[PDB]
Design a protein around this nucleic acid. Structure first.
Lengths: 85, 70, 194, 121
RNA sequence: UACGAUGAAGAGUUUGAUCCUGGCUCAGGAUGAACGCUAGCGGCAGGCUUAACACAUGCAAGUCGAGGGGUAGAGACCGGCGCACGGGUGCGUAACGCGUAUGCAAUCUGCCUUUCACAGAGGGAUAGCCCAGAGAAAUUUGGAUUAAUACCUCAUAGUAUUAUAGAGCGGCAUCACUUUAUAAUUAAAGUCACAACGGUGAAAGAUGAGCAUGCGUCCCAUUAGCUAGUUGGUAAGGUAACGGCUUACCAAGGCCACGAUGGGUAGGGGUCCUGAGAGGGAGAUCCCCCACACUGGUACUGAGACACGGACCAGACUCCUACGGGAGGCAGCAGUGAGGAAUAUUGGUCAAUGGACGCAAGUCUGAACCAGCCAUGCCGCGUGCAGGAUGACGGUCCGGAUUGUAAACUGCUUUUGUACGAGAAGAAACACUCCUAUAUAUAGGAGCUUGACGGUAUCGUAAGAAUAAGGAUCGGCUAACUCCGUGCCAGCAGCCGCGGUAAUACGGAGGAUCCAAGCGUUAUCCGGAAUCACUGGGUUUAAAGGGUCCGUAGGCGGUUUAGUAAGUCAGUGGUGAAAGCCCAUCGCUCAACGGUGGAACGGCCAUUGAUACUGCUGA
């Protein structure tokens, strides 16, 4: 089951996550399939750079987001857009 | 050893006895069958259902059986 | 680290007042030591010339050899004149600009006022002497230590300094034909390329 | 020479035989001495250089030179060989670190204290 | 007088003196570094390179009561999923193992997503429990036995499988896709009611896993023959799948100087160091692939293993024993012994991210995030700032010069250190009650919510220059000279080489130079070395023309002309992972560091053009 999860790539103390679709049987910050977005919880707005052109594509192909993934993809779109059939 | 480790050595035996029974029951038939041909195909398909004999290989056997009985 | 030693000695071993043309530059201007006051060695090697020409600039500002080599190879990434950009980035330091602005009449006092949270750069206080001031920065003075005893006691072509609000508006990055310094950057380049 | 000759058999690169070989390519090696004696240089020097037959931990018998003056170096002592030959004694191709496990340092030394293993007075 | 390219240093030493060839050494950079002297911090990174040597002890993979019988007052058992992920090591392997580019018309695929057709009746058992044992233990033997989403019969179901029979399309040979009849054969599961979660079969997608192929893949030819299922074919057995993968028969083939075979060494790559470049040297930490789990072999369960923390057998170690028999595998985290010159806490938490189970709440997670030790490396700061006379004291000369604004002393700041007061981000959510729409999919808002680090980062307040500088060198190379003591002794030394009683070379003192919380030595590399030279050398006398011809393989090719376009050149599409280097720009007070973008990845496959030069064919 390919999942949409987060990869930590920042520095010690200040994290910085990549929203990426990868297989569940791979390490956290290792192999993946295609980088989708970017998450920075270092400012108050909690900046995101989601890509709705590929997020819904992976969701249709069979991706399965996690809690934080589906909470980032909530207030940035592509969920109220993936629901529309 | 772990608690989960001392459960597979116990359940796989109950699985293996049944698998060996159902495997040899049809192996003896496909051996001493070479018309009652429509009696071992059922066992082969049941093995394929139980995932013992790999429906691909099951179909291989089914094709090889009813090709020399003619 | 810093030098933290006699400055008249450094001026005498180079024959050029780099810490202010004042007392002790005359009155035995010859280099120090029991064998420097006498007739020094006549034949001076080109390696000695280049090394001393590098150390003059390395001592005037207060830079170590490690940081000087780092700055040299940083400025050498520019396609222009390597020595020119080297001296430009060496002059663009924060403590050097604070010294040129009139405050801290010596660079040794500049790198004791800038390292005490007494000066601010573009708002937030910056207490790093090696801060590289890009063209177009606004240097002010902290209002807490604004009315000090030494600042008003101590108080160019590119610095627009205003005495009413301790301004100085660092802009218009100068060139070699404008920065007054008795150093040859080509010799430093040849020494570092040796 | 000819490009065809180079294509057939190219240029042979040599291996650049090393200098210190009997220490297993390690910076220092522990060893035990068996005979501490004195030898003469070749020419025109005239001295009595102090050397020791050291058996390293890898089963190698070497001749080490004792630097400085003042040492114990009995018939059995744990020494630390570091390397560095001398152009006076034919055969001695190693040095002993002063200040190691069992070897003594130096007294009355004030200039070169990092070497010869001398504390700061 | 433009374009791009930001890039290339030498010296000492053969001789009475010179030139040339030629060897040695030094000046630079770097490291999983070690040793000696010294030592104040912060951020970040790194930490058994040797014995894949042997391990005491603790933890590291469990979860589901919304599957079942449910016991004491939860545990344990059957059943489902996971344990094939994550983590560790580099033993072995010179090879389709790896990198690169494709093919599968010779492939499989749990969980995931989207559709279509359905989840109807039945039965016998057995866990757990009970009755008795055989055993020191491990563990195991009898009887009757109650359930399931456990298991097993019949009917049912196709764009399901097989066989026969008709077809269309389409090739890249074997043949490929789809459709139509006929025959045979294969399913289900329900959680007392709702919600919610499920189950079976078929198709498509995604993901994951296999097989094959072209090219690049260390040294030795003081390794020249190797292979007998070996080479090809004909039929069977087979595997997911083609195939000597195996068997039966026929033939003698197949590889080899363009290096078979044999021996030594070694995991491979993105990459790191160095270099102007071409090149050279390594494969720590980060990522991808492969192999292994005390040494070897074998199979079961499972979609997936010939399985690190599963099983069986044999071998060597350690332990228990009642002597009959049994239990073990830190190349997991933290630790012990040994080996070595050398590499650390038997620490805290699931608070973030990921993983397993579950509808969920929730449980586990030595993955992971933090903390301790080691100046191991990179970056940054400090050990004060201004005025002040030629003061004592030392080294030196025959009263002068030197350390020296250096000092005493006079004013100012606390970055850092101590005390006190405030004080974070990393936290977005999950689950439960509220209204909206459509449809059981998505969406908004409410508060008592959720920190190991940690009272950590950070800010403010009050004494006080107070709480903080050493190492190497001074004859030439190479930056820096005087005196005292020893008299070829003690010693120094990278090369030349110094010391036999006036040593700028040994030891000490003064002064001077470099670096700086570091400084020197050693060990392994690149440059200098044009010193293996394609870029970029030579062979009369310095090392170098075979004793001379013929000639095989091979290398090179007189003029013109016609054809193809293999080399060569240009365009397009795909790829050349991420990370790393460089450039530009933003956030940590700057930098290190981190984010974003470009360039680069010099390469390979398909296709379209040009035909000047090389190759091929013809004249």
């Amino acid at each position: 089951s390919v999942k949409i999860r987060l990869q930590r790539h920042g520095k010690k103390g200040k994290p910085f996550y990549w929203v990426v679709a990868a297989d569940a049987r791979s390490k956290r910050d290792g192999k993946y399939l295609e980088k989708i977005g970017t998450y920075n919880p270092n400012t108050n707005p909690a900046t995101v750079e989601l890509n709705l052109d590929s997020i819904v594509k992976w969701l249709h192909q069979g991706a399965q987001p996690t809690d934080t993934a589906r909470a980032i993809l909530s207030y940035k779109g592509a969920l109220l857009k993936h629901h529309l059939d | 050893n772990h608690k989960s480790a001392l459960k597979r050595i116990r359940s796989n035996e109950k699985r293996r006895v049944l698998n060996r029974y159902q495997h040899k029951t049809t192996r003896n038939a496909i051996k001493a069958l070479r018309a009652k041909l429509s009696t071992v195909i059922s066992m082969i398909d049941k093995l394929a259902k139980k995932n013992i004999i790999h429906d691909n290989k099951a179909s291989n056997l089914k094709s090889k059986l009813t090709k020399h009985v003619a | 680290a810093r030098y933290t030693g006699p400055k008249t000695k450094i001026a005498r071993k180079f024959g050029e007042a780099i810490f202010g043309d004042d007392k002790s530059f005359e009155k035995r201007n010859y280099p120090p030591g029991q064998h420097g006051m006498a007739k020094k060695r006549g034949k001076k090697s080109e390696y000695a010339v280049q090394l001393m020409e590098k150390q003059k600039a390395k001592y005037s500002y207060g830079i170590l050899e490690k940081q000087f080599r780092n700055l040299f190879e940083k400025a050498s990434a520019t396609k222009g004149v390597t020595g020119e950009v080297l001296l430009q980035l060496c002059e663009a330091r924060l403590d050097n600009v604070v010294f040129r602005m009139g405050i801290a009449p010596s660079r040794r006092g500049a790198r004791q006022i800038v390292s005490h949270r007494h000066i601010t750069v573009n708002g937030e206080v910056v207490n790093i002497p090696s801060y590289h001031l890009k063209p177009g920065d606004k240097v002010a003075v902290r209002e807490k230590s604004k009315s000090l005893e030494a600042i008003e006691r101590s108080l160019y072509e590119w610095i627009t300094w205003n005495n009413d609000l301790k301004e100085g508006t660092f802009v218009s990055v100068p060139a070699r034909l404008q920065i007054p310094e008795n150093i040859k950057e080509q010799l430093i380049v040849e020494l570092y390329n040796k | 020479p000819t490009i065809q000759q180079l294509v057939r058999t190219g240029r042979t690169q040599i291996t650049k035989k090393s200098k210190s070989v009997a220490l297993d390519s390690c910076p220092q090696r522990r060893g035990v001495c068996t005979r501490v004696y004195t030898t003469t240089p070749k020419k025109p020097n005239s001295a009595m250089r102090k050397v020791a037959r050291v058996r390293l931990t890898n089963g190698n018998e070497v001749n080490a030179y004792i630097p400085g003056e003042g040492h114990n170096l009995q018939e059995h002592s744990i020494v630390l060989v570091r390397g560095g030959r001398v152009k006076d004694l034919p055969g001695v191709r190693y040095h002993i670190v002063r200040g190691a496990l069992d070897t003594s340092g130096v007294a009355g030394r004030t200039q070169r204290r990092s070497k010869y293993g001398a504390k700061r007075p």
